[PDB]
Design an enzyme around this catalytic site. Sequence first.
Site, PDB file in Angstrom:
ATOM      1  N   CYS C 152       0.739  -1.247   0.000  1.00  0.00           N
ATOM      2  CA  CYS C 152       0.000   0.000   0.000  1.00  0.00           C
ATOM      3  C   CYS C 152       0.771   1.301   0.000  1.00  0.00           C
ATOM      4  CB  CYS C 152      -1.024   0.033   1.133  1.00  0.00           C
ATOM      5  SG  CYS C 152      -0.484  -0.434   2.807  1.00  0.00           S
ATOM      6  N   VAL C 156      -0.194   4.051  -2.686  1.00  0.00           N
ATOM      7  CA  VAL C 156      -0.571   5.426  -2.420  1.00  0.00           C
ATOM      8  C   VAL C 156       0.370   6.425  -3.075  1.00  0.00           C
ATOM      9  CG1 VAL C 156      -0.611   7.167  -0.626  1.00  0.00           C
ATOM     10  CG2 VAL C 156      -1.894   5.045  -0.341  1.00  0.00           C
TER      11      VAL C 156
HETATM   12  S1  CLF Z   1       5.196  -1.794   5.875  1.00  0.00           S
HETATM   13 FE1  CLF Z   1      -0.345  -3.728   6.017  1.00  0.00          FE
HETATM   14  S2  CLF Z   1       0.217  -5.773   5.225  1.00  0.00           S
HETATM   15 FE2  CLF Z   1       1.571  -4.312   4.175  1.00  0.00          FE
HETATM   16  S3  CLF Z   1       0.559  -3.784   2.298  1.00  0.00           S
HETATM   17 FE3  CLF Z   1       0.137  -2.299   3.931  1.00  0.00          FE
HETATM   18  S4  CLF Z   1      -1.922  -2.965   4.637  1.00  0.00           S
HETATM   19 FE4  CLF Z   1      -0.947  -4.725   3.665  1.00  0.00          FE
HETATM   20 FE5  CLF Z   1       4.567  -1.967   8.007  1.00  0.00          FE
HETATM   21  S5  CLF Z   1       3.012  -0.393   8.217  1.00  0.00           S
HETATM   22 FE6  CLF Z   1       2.043  -2.292   7.790  1.00  0.00          FE
HETATM   23  S6  CLF Z   1       3.553  -3.889   8.255  1.00  0.00           S
HETATM   24 FE7  CLF Z   1       3.736  -3.459   6.079  1.00  0.00          FE
HETATM   25  S7  CLF Z   1       1.633  -3.006   5.856  1.00  0.00           S
HETATM   26 FE8  CLF Z   1       3.072  -0.954   5.995  1.00  0.00          FE
END
Ligand code: CLF
Lengths: 476, 476, 522, 522
Positions: C152, C156
Amino acid sequence: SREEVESLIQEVLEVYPEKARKDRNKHLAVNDPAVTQSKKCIISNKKSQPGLMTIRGCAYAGSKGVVWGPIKDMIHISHGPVGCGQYSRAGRRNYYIGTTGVNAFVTMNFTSDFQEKDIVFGGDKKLAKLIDEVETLFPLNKGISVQSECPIGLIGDDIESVSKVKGAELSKTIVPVRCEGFRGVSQSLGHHIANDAVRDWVLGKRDEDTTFASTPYDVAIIGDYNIGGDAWSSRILLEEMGLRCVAQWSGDGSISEIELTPKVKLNLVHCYRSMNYISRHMEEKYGIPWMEYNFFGPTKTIESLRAIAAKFDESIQKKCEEVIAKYKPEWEAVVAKYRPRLEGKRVMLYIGGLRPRHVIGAYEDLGMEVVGTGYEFAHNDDYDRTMKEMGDSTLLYDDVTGYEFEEFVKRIKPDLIGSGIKEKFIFQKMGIPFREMHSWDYSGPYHGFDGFAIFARDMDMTLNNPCWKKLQAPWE
Amino acid sequence: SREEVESLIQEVLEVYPEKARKDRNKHLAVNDPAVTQSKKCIISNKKSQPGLMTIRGCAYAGSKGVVWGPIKDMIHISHGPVGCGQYSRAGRRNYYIGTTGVNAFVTMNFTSDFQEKDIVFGGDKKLAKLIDEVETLFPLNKGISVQSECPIGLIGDDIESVSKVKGAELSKTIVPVRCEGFRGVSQSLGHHIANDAVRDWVLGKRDEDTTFASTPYDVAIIGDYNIGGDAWSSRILLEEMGLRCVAQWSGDGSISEIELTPKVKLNLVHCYRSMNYISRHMEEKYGIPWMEYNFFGPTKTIESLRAIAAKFDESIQKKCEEVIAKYKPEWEAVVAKYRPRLEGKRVMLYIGGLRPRHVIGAYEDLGMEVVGTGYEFAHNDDYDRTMKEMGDSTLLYDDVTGYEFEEFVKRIKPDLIGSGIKEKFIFQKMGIPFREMHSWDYSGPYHGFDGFAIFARDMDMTLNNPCWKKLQAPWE
Amino acid sequence: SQQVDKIKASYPLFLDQDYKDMLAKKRDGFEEKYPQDKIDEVFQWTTTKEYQELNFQREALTVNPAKACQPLGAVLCALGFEKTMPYVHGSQGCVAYFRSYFNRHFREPVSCVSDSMTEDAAVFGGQQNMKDGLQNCKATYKPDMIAVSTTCMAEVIGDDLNAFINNSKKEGFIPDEFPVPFAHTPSFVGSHVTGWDNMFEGIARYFTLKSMDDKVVGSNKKINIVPGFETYLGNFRVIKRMLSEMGVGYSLLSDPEEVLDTPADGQFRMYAGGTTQEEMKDAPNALNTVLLQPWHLEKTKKFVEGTWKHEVPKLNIPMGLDWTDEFLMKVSEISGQPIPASLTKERGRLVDMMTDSHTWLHGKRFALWGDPDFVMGLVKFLLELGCEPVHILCHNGNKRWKKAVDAILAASPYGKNATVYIGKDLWHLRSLVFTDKPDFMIGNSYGKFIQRDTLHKGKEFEVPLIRIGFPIFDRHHLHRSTTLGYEGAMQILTTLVNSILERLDEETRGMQATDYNHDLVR
Amino acid sequence: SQQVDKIKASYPLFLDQDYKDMLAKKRDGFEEKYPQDKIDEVFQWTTTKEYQELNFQREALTVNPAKACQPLGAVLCALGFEKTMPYVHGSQGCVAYFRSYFNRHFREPVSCVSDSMTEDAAVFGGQQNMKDGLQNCKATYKPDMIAVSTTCMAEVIGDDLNAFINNSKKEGFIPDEFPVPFAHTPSFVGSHVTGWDNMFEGIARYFTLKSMDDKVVGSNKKINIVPGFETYLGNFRVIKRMLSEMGVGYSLLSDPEEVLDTPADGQFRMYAGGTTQEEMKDAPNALNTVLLQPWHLEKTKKFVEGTWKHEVPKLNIPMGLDWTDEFLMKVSEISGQPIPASLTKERGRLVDMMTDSHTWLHGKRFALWGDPDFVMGLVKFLLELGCEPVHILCHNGNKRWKKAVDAILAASPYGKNATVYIGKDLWHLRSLVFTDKPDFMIGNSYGKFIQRDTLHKGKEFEVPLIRIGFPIFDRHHLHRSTTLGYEGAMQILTTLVNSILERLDEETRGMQATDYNHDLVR
Ligand code: CLF
Ligand code: CLF
Ligand SMILES: [Ca+2]
Ligand SMILES: [Ca+2]
């Protein structure tokens, strides 16, 4: 039609060799409700023809399996080789309340476990050693019974002396019972051997004791084995009507209850075949009258409650009416929900002695028609009682062989079949809904008003289950 | 040997492209126990090279996953899309006591669950709506925290204002936390973001409150997360020594314990990397001193109990000796049973920040030798502490790639490997016994004396399990 | 304290008196815990109807979701291909989470890589990470193919995947010829199933789009099977076995079964099996393409119908007696091959097990949840068994799907008390089991907690959890099970009847209380 | 009373207050029951060490046996042959019992017939019943072959089977040519396993004894497999599958799998599959004969080694990792065919499951019982898993076998607390689980009651029963499982680890008491 059923019986018998064919035709009859005597119509309780796959058990099953096993307090030793005790353990659901292995021993398997040393030498010394052993290990048992397996009669073992001597030594009642499987021709002689055994060794103990206080309303349920709690459901109805139930034979029974039975005013006999021997005896020795009653379905129960109540005073008769009033809305609710579901459906039944005739009212209470019925080991007096209940030109069979049964079913084509465990898997494969009549297919109780709701519900789920539509593969 | 290890490092690095190879060599070192400064030996806490399969998590994992999630009373909202909250739910065993969903919410997953409308429009209105919703549904929660997922920093959502405005409205503490995954290069910046968040929004609330009664013996365990109940086993030892434990950070923690922390006389810091930021702050603001301690293995625990007790008076010092006396026969019994079993076995460890250096004493207490060790996201001060503990010419790796790790293990050939979940299945396949260091393989606690027995027993069952003999098929 | 002869783990170690005293002191001394009576008052409140309404009124807060993000779906699908390395463009914390979630459910290694985009990468873009990442990953892991998906953060900021990948090849980081299919997989949009659908259409599109003229439909005489997002190995195995049994030629696109099941023989295999690139290239030459889980395979259905011109048959996921009959008959019509005697025997056996276990199964009430195809399949099977599914929940489901299921329920007299809920979490379900009580719950390991809550209200109010679904983390090797086909139906039937019998035994095990019904033969 | 909307079965119908009052009145009024305190005092007494000694002191009374009679063994083996009808000479009640015991365990029809000997038949002999019985049975069921076994009444009176059968043919009741193998099967001697061994040596002896000159060993290049008494379909299926996978030609003598598993397709099949008469006649021409369960296959080993001159290899029942390896290598040596890649992968997976589930399985204590081969195989496997088998009981076992098992236990550091008991019943075992407590019990449905007794002493004293074995009557379709081979090992491993995890979950499910250890991922 009558000509068609008669032809069907003749047509089936063609496969059998002559001695067997000649004998079998005597056991198959097209029913005439008009006939008073069964012997004109059908012959019964004769030795089975070999190699024909009869559904009949042995005398040991009738005595150890049905009359004796259900008593909770006493310990029953299967005397002989290990197999009889093993196959029959916890096989039948004669429900009981107790602490098992401590004060109640019904599901437990107790055996002499004969080996060859025992067969050559004999089992008396061992039985005595087993009795002593039984006593140290299970101190709260209230009785002991020795059920003879086939080798006991054949090897010349005297169990009466051991039972008499040990009983005297332990001041405990030990009942030797000679239900050797070779004796008799079905589970039937075992009931008689068992009934006679109960009368010689356990009935007359409180012959002279007058301490127990008895009301004029005291009654004993005879021949209800509490399969699935049938006796308990039957028992609550008699209690609500105002009668007091001193004893149950032999489901959820206790030896104390049995010994206290002669004190009772009336004996209600549910199963005529199994315990009529003891009932007649009680009437001759103690003068206590016995009446056959039926608790399957609301109609038989209402008719039964009413008959039992008449034998008593107006307070009881009045109470009987309150109870019929109380459960009337419950039963009719069941009929309203399930009759439209089961209406006009033809039923075929095969069971051993009391049930083929007895469950007819309940099925009819649901709008189901019983096209044919038979008995594993029923006597002709049983058949006399049957024809009035069975409709006209309906098929009747005694000791039906497996082959005869499949052929009759293929021709008749019943919607549902009520029978035992050996018969059930063959029919489901055939696509015909099957309900086991003996074990109530692990459901029940089927007795009484409470029992009737379970029964209607059970016939309906099995008969109308979605699995029957699915048998032929879609690709033709 | 040193030349051999150095060659092994050079040999492995040959596969990598130049920018990645040049950078990686800085992260692999042959250990010299003599060196004072880590930077001469190894470089650390730098952005990971892409496509190399680093084991590092994100800042969200360090803040939501490790510091914040364990607090029992507060509710933590994973702000952003549904995945981060979901992968991390009940993943880590920070054990706590509470009625879940009613007064304690650790295993629960609370999320804003962003969809595209939220990404386009933004999530502030939703966060406020979520805060209101959280309040009606879970009335006994003592706090709320918003953990920012990656989209929060990027879409321009201001969570500080929503947290400030709602908090004011609900007279509830709401802590916005900016642990966006993209911020930082490992689970490490998250700890700092989380530590700073705790200090700005929750530490100073009882700044002026003097109602709580404080003894001179009061202490707070800082950086023990109670994995498998590690804190509880660590806590009972301090209590038996006579110290009173006001707070646990943050395992089985409560917001009330944290707010009462500054009242404590000394802060014992178990995990230096995660909470040293808060410890330093407390020393500057409140003057409370902080000391790093180790409870893994009997030797570190005895040494640690001793050091903590010196910071206190003679009664405490005396009590410390009674406790060491009390548990001495228990630990030595464990050593006697398990050392002969695990003696001389070489161990390789890869874990993120505190454990590679810390569990060394315990393994040595069992006679095991740690041949190599590394860190997922450790800073150089962590490495400064590590070399004294590590033996000479032993292999050290920072942010080891998966490929580097397999090659190192194939060459070194350790008897047992302690590492996380991603690394474990590869090694078992290779036939090398593996114990998970992060989750203590669903066992534990490994802390303290009580923890040590479980630990020796665990290394022994896995290392000596019969399944390792069975890998090559008998037919060659 | 620990007796060395019998060491105690957390449980029942903390059950010891010294620890019990310590925790209480800690709770009384510093926790400032609400009284137990209050906690009790609040707990009984959540079990109520009044609370369900406030709980079902939620518009912004999701508690205990039944869905995961897209890249998980994308990484699993990428794993289906031979010598293929899943590659996720974006931040690294996501990759660690996907590997761990997969590792725990499959108890197998999961290989995945990230280009590791940072804060700095956020302002500039994902271009450097993609070139270095592609170059580093290829040199290090030697994957034949690298399939890109995105996190994501990447979605974005808006990195262009196609532009980035091309410039990497153009600039010389990786060969021009090296396969690099890519699919954008926004976590905010959809679920892991959609994530799986996107990755697949992208892989299918990359291999087959440029050359379509040479391809002619039905030329290779094999039927393409697209599994969808699947976490049960028996499923991949069963579909292949039946086609094999029938003699039908087939190509299973995205088969992750060998890799997720490699043997411990002393050597670690990063890559095992997988769908071949040639299998992917020669796919349009199939007679037809069958999609096993159609509800999350919508994008792929559009690419396959439009580009390959295959008329994808409308078939439900082959679950239950009717759906499996339909899938086989359909394969028979497309293949031209007859359904063998062997398969017809298996169906017979399923029916025999159904007739044999019908009394215990009849009328049982179930609350179940999962991905839409699986839930839909299970609902159809339970109705075929005469069981009553009271609460049906699909978190990642939709209006069309809900409509589809309601139709299924309407077709059966059994689906009368049944209600389908979409967009509702496990917190909602908890409320449903408490207000209207199912006999059983069919779902993943997340339901362990709902069960715990019901037992808390009372023994009689507890709803045992039966695990079928994904993820399952508290039990071992269940991922080796099969839910598809007759075999799957048999497994499902045995688990449900035995779950029901296991429960009856527990309830009737009390001595001289309920043991009258604790029967030897059931 | 019954609400028609929710009807109550025995349980929880009798739990109703009117019924509870009635039962109590009944108990107080006529039962003359011992006080509850006395019942409690006596029950606590049986749980003790003192009681175990008196209990183990028994020389004449057997309580709750773990063995059945010979004809059961004979009927099952007779079922293995094509178009063969088991026929038991003697009394009929035995046949009803064998069919029922088999029907319940297999939930399939069981065909068996009796000549129905009576009291009168006892004085005269079994000659008439045998002629009529053979004649009637053949006319009615059309079996190609009829295999005679005998009930104890027949054994005690001494009817000569061979003389009776010959006279039946001689007198013209059945054709001379119609196959009628017979085996005397005394219930007092042995068990159903011995009963199975006798029927088989008899069938094998009837077909191959008269003609041996034409037979030459290794001429047909197939390996004879004799299954022994087996109640798991998966076992017949697994042995055939592997040999088939290996390419080894084989003859499975006595294969009851098709008949015990016929499909419900609207037609009842009395007979299905089975070992062919020709397969039996051409048997001596095999390279070698492998006996799957050697402990109860002793008589057959003597006939095969002596008459057919096959050198039967000494191999343990193929259970566990090592015994399966040994069986396969041995087949490889006899067949000359190599072990395929496919089978080696399976072994790999079994080990991978073992490495994956080792920490939960390690050190677990088990009390188990069964027939000697199966018990022996299970004990070997548990030790391979590092589990600790504390109590091993084989009712129908012997001194040589006990010696063999102790040897197996001595070989592993794991079998330290293990003790083997023979000739001891389940009553003995109940005492053992109470005095020294196993974590679990592995056995048939008879153990449901031992578990009930333990839970009675307390929650903490309860030993959950894990069902592997025969007969299993309280669960459905378990007879479809496999215990042999890698597949069997995998099934057993999954059931044991999951039984252990299932139990941990139950123990940690209490709210704010033990839920701290009620983990999502295990
Ligand atoms: S670095 Fe979360 S699993 Fe991921 S693609 Fe986003 S929704 Fe899906 Fe860190 S903050 Fe979280 S853990 Fe990753 S996702 Fe970003
Ligand atoms: S008619 Fe018992 S199973 Fe049989 S061969 Fe004997 S040991 Fe064995 Fe009746 S009394 Fe009993 S049940 Fe039969 S056996 Fe005789
Ligand atoms: Ca694995
Ligand atoms: Ca069946």
